[PDB]
Write a protein that binds this ligand. Sequence first.
Ligand SMILES: [Cl-]
Ligand SMILES: [Cl-]
Lengths: 92, 360
Amino acid sequence: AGRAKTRSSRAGLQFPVGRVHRLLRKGNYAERVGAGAPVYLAAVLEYLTAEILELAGNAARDNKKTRIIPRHLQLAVRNDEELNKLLGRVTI
Amino acid sequence: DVVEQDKLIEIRNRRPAVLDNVYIRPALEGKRVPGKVEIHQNGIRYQSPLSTTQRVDVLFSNIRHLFFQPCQNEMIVIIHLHLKDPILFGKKKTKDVQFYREAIQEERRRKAELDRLFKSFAEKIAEAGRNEGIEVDMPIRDLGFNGVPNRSNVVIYPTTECLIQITEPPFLVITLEDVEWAHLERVQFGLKNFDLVFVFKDFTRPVVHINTIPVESLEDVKEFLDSSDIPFSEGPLNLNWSVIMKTVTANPHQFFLDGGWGFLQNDSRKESYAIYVYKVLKQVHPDTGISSKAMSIMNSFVNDVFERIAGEASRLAHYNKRSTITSREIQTAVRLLLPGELAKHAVSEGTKAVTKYTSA
Ligand SMILES: [Cl-]
Ligand SMILES: [Cl-]
C-alpha cells in the first residue's frame, strides 16, 4: 500500500462520501452527522444518477446519437412514471 | 532530486559586469544581508558576503524567462529568473530566483535611477545570453488584474509570454504556451467576483487557481484569454479539478471524444457533482457522452434530491428527539420521498453500500 482507501472506495462508490458528509454538516441539518449517513445518501444519489443516465443514454443511441442532450433527458424522465413523479417536468 | 547543471564558466580577463546591493529570494540560510550579481560567459552568479560558499550559479541555458519589473509604481525593483529545471537552494529547491532592492518629488530621481540601473543590467544578461535566445520580458501594466493565487490579494500581470506575480512570495509564473484550457467559475448574475482556473497540457500537473477576481475585470480577463489564443469556458459552480484531472489523465482520448473540457460546465450554494455524473455515465454507457446543458440538468437533479432527503432527515431527527442524523433517518426519508419501486431499490443500494463499508 502507499495511500489509504477513501471512504467512497470502501463503500464501492463513485460519488464522494467525504464531501457529502461535509455538505450535510455545512447545511446545519443537525447537531451531528454520523459516518453512516453520507455513505447511504451518496449511494442513493449514485443509484438515481445511474438509472436516469441509463434511460437517457438509450434514447440517444436509439436516435443514432453519441451524445446525450436535454431532449433525451426530458424524454427519459417524462416517459418513466416514477422518475417523472420524483424529478418533475424537464423544460428546455 | 534535480537536473544536473554544467559548471559556470567565469570571466577572469576583466572585472565582470556587476549589480551591487541586491537581496535574493528565496532567502538563504543566515542573516539577511545584501549581495551582488555578476555576469559571466555561461551564466550569472549571485554572491553573499557572509562566505565565499554562499552563492548561486545560474546558467543562461536554464533560464526560461527573464522578467524586469520597475518600481515606478511599487516599493521594490526586481529582476526575476524563472528556470526550465529547478535547482538546489541550500536545503530546498527552487524554480525561481529573483534579485531586488528596496526604495526607501525627491524620490522621483532615486526611483527612476534605480530602474535604469536594473533595466540595463537585465539587458546585459540577455545580451550575454543571446546564444540561448534570452530576452527581457516585462509586465504589461495596463492589462493587470487583482486576484488570490494563495492567501492575499495581489495584482496579476500579463507579459509577452506569461502571466505573473513576482512582487511578493509565493511567486506565480504561468507560461501561456503550457496552457490547455481556462475555466471561469462562480460566473453568475450578479457576481461580485469569480475564480479563474488554468489547466495545463501536461495533465499530471496540478491546475492553478486564481481566486476572487473582481467582476469589473471579467471582460478584460476574457479578452486576454482570447488574445492569447487560450480557449475557455465559464459557469456558476466550482469544479472538482483534482478528481477531473485524474479521470482525464487515465483515458484522455475518450474524454475528448465525449466533448472535452466544455461539458463539465458551460452556462454562458450549489455543488458540482459533474465529474461523478460522468464517472457513472462511463459505467453505464462507456461510449456515450453528455452535453453541457444536459450535464447541468443532471447536476440540478442531484442537488435537488440531496436537499430534499437531507431536509426530511433533519425533520425526522427533530421529531424523534435525536440530535444526530444517521443512516436510519436517511433511509426513512428516502422511503417517504421516493416512489415505491424506485424507493425499494434505492433503500437496497444504500443498505448494500453501508454493509460493504462497515465490513471493511
Ligand atoms: Cl471519500
Ligand atoms: Cl466537477
